[PDB]
Structures are given as structure tokens and as C-alpha cells.
Ligand binder design. Structure first.
Ligand SMILES: Cc1cn([C@H]2C[C@H](O)[C@@H](COP(=O)(O)O)O2)c(=O)[nH]c1=O
Ligand SMILES: [Mn+2]
Ligand SMILES: [Mn+2]
Length: 180
């Protein structure tokens, strides 16, 4: 039923892109159904984080959602043209205003736990922004990048997703499946 939840409650472009990423990783969205939901949720937050934000050129470049080949193509181009340090792992966005990459985490555990996992892996100039399903966020140097309204929008979406999962008795399983 999580499969059904995902196809019923995410935009179909998001679900198609989540399927695509799983196939590239070698994982079956028909089996790893909680991960499927997590990938959809994370992609949606990436798209929400970028949407409506301009400098009209887009303020953010979206890296998540692209396959690895295209994602490195875009990262390489940005590093070449801006001189910013090249990350050793693919991040989620680039912020043309602050000239830094951003790694987005969406977590169903303590926000600090997920923050430390990302940071332990990043080893540095990539900015980290973690959101939870409880309304909490944590970001590097307490710098949340976006305005308060745009963050509230993401938080509301996460609030809504949690509430609907719980109505279908999908939340408890989903929540306990997260591991780093
Ligand atoms: C890099 C990677 C991410 N994912 C998932 C974990 C997260 O739910 C989602 C977003 O990843 P991220 O926070 O590392 O950008 O994609 C995989 O399933 N396999 C992978 O190799
Ligand atoms: Mn990513
Ligand atoms: Mn991420």
C-alpha cells in the first residue's frame, strides 16, 4: 500500500524521476517501498527549495533528479565557471547567490543525527540544510538560506505527508525504516 500511497500522493513527474533514480542505483521501488517514498519526498523538497527563487535567472541549479552523468556534467560546469571547490560527492543544489553547493536532508530521526551523517561524509564548503517531519530544521552555521515563508511551505508539505501516512497506517513503518 506504500506503493499506492506514493503514486496517489506525489506528482507523477516526481514518482517517474524517483523510479528512474532507483533503477540507476539497482534498487526496486516495488520492494524498497519506504525508500521509494523517501526519495520522492526528498526530490519534492529539492524542487520546492528551488521553485520561485530568482536573481530572471534561477537562483538555484537543481542537481538532484538528474542521472550521475548529467549531474557531474552540471557540477563540473559550475565549478569551472565559478571557481568554487569541487565536491567529492554529488550535492542537491547550487546556489548562484551565495555561490555554494547545498546538500538537503529530509529525516524521520533527530535532525542533528542526519546533519552529522552528511557532515561526516562531506569532509567541506558544501552547505547542509536538514528538514524533519516534525517541523525542525538544522543548517550549517544556523544559515537557512531561504526566507522564512519558503521554509514554512516545505515544512507544511512534510507535515501533510506525515499526517496522510499515519491515516493509512504507513507512518510507523516508514519512520523506523530510516538508517544511515
Ligand atoms: C546517493 C543515494 C541516495 N539515495 C536516496 C537516499 C535519500 O532518500 C535520497 C536523497 O539522497 P541525498 O540526501 O543523499 O541527496 O536518495 C539512495 O537510495 N541511494 C544512493 O546511492
Ligand atoms: Mn542528492
Ligand atoms: Mn540530499
Amino acid at each position: 500500500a506504500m506503493e499506492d500511497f506514493v503514486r496517489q500522493c506525489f506528482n507523477p513527474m516526481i514518482v517517474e524521476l524517483a523510479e528512474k533514480a532507483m533503477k540507476e542505483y539497482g534498487e526496486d521501488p516495488k520492494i524498497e517501498t519506504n525508500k521509494f517514498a523517501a526519495i520522492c519526498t526528498h526530490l519534492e523538497v529539492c524542487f520546492m527549495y528551488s521553485d520561485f527563487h530568482f536573481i530572471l535567472k534561477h537562483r538555484f541549479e537543481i542537481i538532484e533528479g538528474r542521472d550521475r552523468i548529467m549531474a557531474w556534467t552540471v557540477v563540473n560546469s559550475i565549478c569551472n565557471t565559478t571557481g568554487v571547490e569541487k565536491p567529492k560527492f554529488l550535492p542537491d543544489l547550487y546556489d548562484y547567490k551565495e555561490n555554494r553547493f547545498i546538500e538537503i536532508g529530509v529525516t524521520r530521526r533527530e535532525v542533528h543525527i542526519y546533519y552529522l551523517e552528511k557532515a561526516n561524509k562531506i569532509k567541506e564548503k558544501t552547505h547542509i540544510h536538514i528538514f524533519s517531519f516534525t517541523g525542525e530544521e538544522m543548517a550549517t552555521k544556523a544559515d537557512y538560506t531561504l526566507d522564512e515563508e519558503s521554509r514554512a511551505r516545505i515544512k507544511t508539505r512534510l507535515f501533510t505527508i506525515r499526517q496522510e501516512m499515519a491515516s493509512r497506517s504507513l507512518w510507523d513503518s516508514f519512520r523506523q525504516s530510516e538508517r544511515g
